[PDB]
PDB file of C-alpha atoms in Angstrom:
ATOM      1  CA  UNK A   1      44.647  72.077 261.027  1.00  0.00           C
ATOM      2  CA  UNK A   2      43.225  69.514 263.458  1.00  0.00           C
ATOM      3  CA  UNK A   3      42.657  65.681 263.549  1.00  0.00           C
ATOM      4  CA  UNK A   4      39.990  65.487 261.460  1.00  0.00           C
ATOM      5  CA  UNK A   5      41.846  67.476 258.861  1.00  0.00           C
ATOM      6  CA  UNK A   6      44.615  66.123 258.637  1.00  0.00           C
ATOM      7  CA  UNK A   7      42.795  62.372 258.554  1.00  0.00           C
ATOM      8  CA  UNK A   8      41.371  64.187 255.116  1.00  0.00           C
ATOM      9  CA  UNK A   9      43.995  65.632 253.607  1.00  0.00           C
ATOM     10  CA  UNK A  10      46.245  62.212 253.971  1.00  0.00           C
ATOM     11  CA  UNK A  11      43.503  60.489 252.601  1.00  0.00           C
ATOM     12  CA  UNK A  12      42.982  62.588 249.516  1.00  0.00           C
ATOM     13  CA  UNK A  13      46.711  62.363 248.807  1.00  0.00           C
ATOM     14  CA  UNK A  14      47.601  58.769 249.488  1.00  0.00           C
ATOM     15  CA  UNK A  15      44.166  58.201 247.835  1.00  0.00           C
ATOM     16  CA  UNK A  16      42.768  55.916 250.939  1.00  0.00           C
ATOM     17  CA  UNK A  17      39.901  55.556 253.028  1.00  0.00           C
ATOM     18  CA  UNK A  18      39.541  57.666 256.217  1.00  0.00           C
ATOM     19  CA  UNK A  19      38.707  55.337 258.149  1.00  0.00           C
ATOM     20  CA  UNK A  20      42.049  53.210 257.425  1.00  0.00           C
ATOM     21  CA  UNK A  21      43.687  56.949 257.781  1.00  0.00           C
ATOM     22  CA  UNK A  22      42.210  57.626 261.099  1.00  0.00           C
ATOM     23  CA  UNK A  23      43.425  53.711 262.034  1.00  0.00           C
ATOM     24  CA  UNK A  24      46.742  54.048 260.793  1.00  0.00           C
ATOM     25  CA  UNK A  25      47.519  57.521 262.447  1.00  0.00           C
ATOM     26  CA  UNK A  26      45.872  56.921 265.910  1.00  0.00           C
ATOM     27  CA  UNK A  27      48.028  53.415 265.764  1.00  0.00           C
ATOM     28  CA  UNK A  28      50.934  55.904 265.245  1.00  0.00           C
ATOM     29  CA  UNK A  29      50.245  58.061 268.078  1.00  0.00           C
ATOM     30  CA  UNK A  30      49.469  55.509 270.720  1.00  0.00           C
ATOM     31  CA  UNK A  31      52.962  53.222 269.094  1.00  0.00           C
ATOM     32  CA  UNK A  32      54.930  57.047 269.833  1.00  0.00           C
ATOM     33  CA  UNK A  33      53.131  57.741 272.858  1.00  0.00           C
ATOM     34  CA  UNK A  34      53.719  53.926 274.162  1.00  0.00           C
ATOM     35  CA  UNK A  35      57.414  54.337 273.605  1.00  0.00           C
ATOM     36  CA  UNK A  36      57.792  57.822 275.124  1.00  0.00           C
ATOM     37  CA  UNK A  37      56.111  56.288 278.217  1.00  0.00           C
ATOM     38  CA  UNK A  38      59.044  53.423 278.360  1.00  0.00           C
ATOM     39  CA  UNK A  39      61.557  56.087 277.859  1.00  0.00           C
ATOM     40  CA  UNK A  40      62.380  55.239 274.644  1.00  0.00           C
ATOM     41  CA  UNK A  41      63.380  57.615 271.793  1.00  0.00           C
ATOM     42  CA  UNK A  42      61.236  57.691 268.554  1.00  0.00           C
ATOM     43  CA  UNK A  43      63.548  59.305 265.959  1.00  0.00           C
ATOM     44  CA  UNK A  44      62.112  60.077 262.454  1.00  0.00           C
ATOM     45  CA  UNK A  45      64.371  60.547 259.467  1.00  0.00           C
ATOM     46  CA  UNK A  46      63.806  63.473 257.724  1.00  0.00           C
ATOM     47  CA  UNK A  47      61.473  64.838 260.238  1.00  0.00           C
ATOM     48  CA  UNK A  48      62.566  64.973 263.909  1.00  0.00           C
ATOM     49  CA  UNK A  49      62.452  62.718 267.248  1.00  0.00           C
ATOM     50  CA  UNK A  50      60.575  62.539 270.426  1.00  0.00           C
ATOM     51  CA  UNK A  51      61.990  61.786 273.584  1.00  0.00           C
ATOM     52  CA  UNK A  52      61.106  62.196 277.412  1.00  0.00           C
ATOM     53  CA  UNK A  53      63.491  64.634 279.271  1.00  0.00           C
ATOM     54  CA  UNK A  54      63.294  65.868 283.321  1.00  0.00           C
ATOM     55  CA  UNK A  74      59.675  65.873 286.440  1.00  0.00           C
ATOM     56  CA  UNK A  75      59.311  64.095 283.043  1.00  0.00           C
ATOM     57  CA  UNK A  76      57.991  65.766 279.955  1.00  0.00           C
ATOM     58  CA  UNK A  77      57.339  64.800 276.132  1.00  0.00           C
ATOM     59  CA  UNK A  78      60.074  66.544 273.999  1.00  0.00           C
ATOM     60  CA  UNK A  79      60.186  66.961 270.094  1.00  0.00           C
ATOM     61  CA  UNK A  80      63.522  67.705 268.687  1.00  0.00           C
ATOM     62  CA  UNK A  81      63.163  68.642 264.731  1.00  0.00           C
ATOM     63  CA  UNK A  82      65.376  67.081 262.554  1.00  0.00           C
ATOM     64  CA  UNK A  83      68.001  68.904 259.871  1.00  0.00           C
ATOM     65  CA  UNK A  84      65.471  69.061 256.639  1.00  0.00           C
ATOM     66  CA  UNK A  85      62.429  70.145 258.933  1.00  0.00           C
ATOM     67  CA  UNK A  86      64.500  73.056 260.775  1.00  0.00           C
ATOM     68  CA  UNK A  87      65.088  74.121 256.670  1.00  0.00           C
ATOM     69  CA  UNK A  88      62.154  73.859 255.261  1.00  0.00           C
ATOM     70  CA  UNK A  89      60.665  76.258 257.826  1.00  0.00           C
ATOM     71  CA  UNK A  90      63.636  78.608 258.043  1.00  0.00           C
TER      72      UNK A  90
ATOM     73  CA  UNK B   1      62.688  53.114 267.825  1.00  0.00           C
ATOM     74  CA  UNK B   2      63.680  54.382 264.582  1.00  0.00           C
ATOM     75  CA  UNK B   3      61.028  54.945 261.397  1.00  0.00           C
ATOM     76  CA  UNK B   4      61.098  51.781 259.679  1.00  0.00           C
ATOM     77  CA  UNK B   5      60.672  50.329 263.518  1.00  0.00           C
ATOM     78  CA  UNK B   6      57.452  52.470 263.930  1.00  0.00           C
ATOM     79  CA  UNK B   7      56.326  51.471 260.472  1.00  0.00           C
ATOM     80  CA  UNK B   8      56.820  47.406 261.263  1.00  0.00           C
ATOM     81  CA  UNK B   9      55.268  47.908 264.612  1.00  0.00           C
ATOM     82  CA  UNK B  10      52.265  49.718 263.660  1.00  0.00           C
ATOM     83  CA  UNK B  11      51.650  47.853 260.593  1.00  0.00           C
ATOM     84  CA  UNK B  12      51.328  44.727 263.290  1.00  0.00           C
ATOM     85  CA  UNK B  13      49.093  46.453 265.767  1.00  0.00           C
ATOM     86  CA  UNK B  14      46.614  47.849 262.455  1.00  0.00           C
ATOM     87  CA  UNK B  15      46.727  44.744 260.404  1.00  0.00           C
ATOM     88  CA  UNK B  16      47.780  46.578 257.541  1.00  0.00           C
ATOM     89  CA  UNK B  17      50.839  46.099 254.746  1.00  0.00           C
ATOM     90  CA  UNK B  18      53.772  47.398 255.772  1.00  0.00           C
ATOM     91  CA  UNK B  19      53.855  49.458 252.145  1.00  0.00           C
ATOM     92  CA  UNK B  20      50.450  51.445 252.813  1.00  0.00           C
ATOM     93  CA  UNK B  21      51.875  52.004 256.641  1.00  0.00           C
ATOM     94  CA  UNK B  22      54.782  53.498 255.303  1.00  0.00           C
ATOM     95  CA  UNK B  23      52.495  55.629 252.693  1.00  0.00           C
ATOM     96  CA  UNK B  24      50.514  56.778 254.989  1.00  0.00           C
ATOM     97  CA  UNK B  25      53.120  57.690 257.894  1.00  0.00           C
ATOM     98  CA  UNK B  26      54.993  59.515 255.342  1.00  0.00           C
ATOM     99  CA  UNK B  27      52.075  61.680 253.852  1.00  0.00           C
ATOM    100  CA  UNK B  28      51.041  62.068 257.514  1.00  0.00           C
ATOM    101  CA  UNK B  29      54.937  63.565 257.972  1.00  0.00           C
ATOM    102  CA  UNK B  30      54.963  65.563 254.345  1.00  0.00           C
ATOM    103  CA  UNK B  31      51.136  67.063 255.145  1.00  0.00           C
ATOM    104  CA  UNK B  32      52.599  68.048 258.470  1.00  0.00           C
ATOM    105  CA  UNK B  33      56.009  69.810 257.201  1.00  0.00           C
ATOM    106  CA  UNK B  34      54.073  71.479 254.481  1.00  0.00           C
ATOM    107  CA  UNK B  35      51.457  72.727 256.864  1.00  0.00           C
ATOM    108  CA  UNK B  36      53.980  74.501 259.258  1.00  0.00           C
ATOM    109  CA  UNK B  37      56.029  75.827 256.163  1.00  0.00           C
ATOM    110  CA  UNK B  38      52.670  77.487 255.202  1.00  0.00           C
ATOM    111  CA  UNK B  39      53.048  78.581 258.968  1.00  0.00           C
ATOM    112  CA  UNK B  40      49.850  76.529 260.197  1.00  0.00           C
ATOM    113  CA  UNK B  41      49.002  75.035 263.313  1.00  0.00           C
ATOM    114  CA  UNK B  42      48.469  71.231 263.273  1.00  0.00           C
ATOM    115  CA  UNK B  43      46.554  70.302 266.531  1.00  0.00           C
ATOM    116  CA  UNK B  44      46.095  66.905 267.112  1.00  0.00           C
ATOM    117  CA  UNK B  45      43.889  65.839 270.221  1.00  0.00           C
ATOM    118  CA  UNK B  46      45.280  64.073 272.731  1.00  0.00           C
ATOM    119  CA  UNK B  47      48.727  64.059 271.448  1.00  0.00           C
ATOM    120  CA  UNK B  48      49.895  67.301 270.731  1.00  0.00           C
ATOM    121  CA  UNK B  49      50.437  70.553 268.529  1.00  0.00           C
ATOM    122  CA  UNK B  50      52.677  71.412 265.676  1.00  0.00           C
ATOM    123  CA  UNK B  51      53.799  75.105 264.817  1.00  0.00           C
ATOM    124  CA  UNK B  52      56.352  77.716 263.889  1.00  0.00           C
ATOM    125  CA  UNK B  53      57.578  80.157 266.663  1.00  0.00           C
ATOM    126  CA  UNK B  54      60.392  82.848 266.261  1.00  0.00           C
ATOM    127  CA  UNK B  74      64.294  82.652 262.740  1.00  0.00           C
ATOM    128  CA  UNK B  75      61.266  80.964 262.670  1.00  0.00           C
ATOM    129  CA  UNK B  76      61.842  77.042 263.704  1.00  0.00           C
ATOM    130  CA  UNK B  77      59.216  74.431 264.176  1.00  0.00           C
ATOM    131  CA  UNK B  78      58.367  73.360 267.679  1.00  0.00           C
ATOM    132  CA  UNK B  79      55.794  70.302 269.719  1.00  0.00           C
ATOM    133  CA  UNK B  80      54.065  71.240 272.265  1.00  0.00           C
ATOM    134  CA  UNK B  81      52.525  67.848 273.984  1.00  0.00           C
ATOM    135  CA  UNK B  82      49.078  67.838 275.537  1.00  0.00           C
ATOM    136  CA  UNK B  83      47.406  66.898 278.622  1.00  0.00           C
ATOM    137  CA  UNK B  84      46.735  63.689 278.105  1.00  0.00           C
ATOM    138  CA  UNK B  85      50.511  62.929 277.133  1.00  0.00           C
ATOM    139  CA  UNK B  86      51.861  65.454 279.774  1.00  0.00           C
ATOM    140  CA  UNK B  87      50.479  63.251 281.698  1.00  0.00           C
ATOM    141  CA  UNK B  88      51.109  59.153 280.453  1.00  0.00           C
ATOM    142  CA  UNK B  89      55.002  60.275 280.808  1.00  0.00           C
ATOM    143  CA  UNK B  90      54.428  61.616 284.069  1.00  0.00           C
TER     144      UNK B  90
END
């Protein structure tokens, strides 16, 4: 699945427009990417968090009901 | 940051009710989990890719462009 995809398939199921999708979810990434750039932490319930660790890199640490539902 | 922080801080940047932030984030999140339980890839350019690995757990790698903001 890529971008574009996933911009669909959101919109069919929360039955609204792409383009307020494709707003919504690129204001997501740039808020998460903003905040990894500070060195903050961006933790999710019920899906994971995203942190910066050393040099620096992007890290994604799933959460307790993701690690399940894949395993 | 934590989710409902995201949600509020989004919601500002898009102009948009915090209730259809937090529907969309969350079918964003759900579309994502049930993508990688179906043990798809979810590519998303110029942030990053979702997807199972070997048992199996899920796992982020970022991209260039935020390889790169964070260092």
């Amino acid at each position: 699945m890529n971008k574009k995809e996933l911009i669909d398939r959101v919109a069919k199921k929360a039955g609204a427009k792409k383009k307020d999708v494709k707003l919504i979810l690129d204001t997501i990434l740039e808020t998460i990417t903003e905040a990894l750039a500070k060195g903050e932490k961006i933790q999710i319930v019920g899906f994971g968090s995203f942190e910066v660790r050393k040099r620096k890199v992007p890290k994604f640490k799933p959460g307790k009901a993701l690690k399940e539902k894949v395993k």
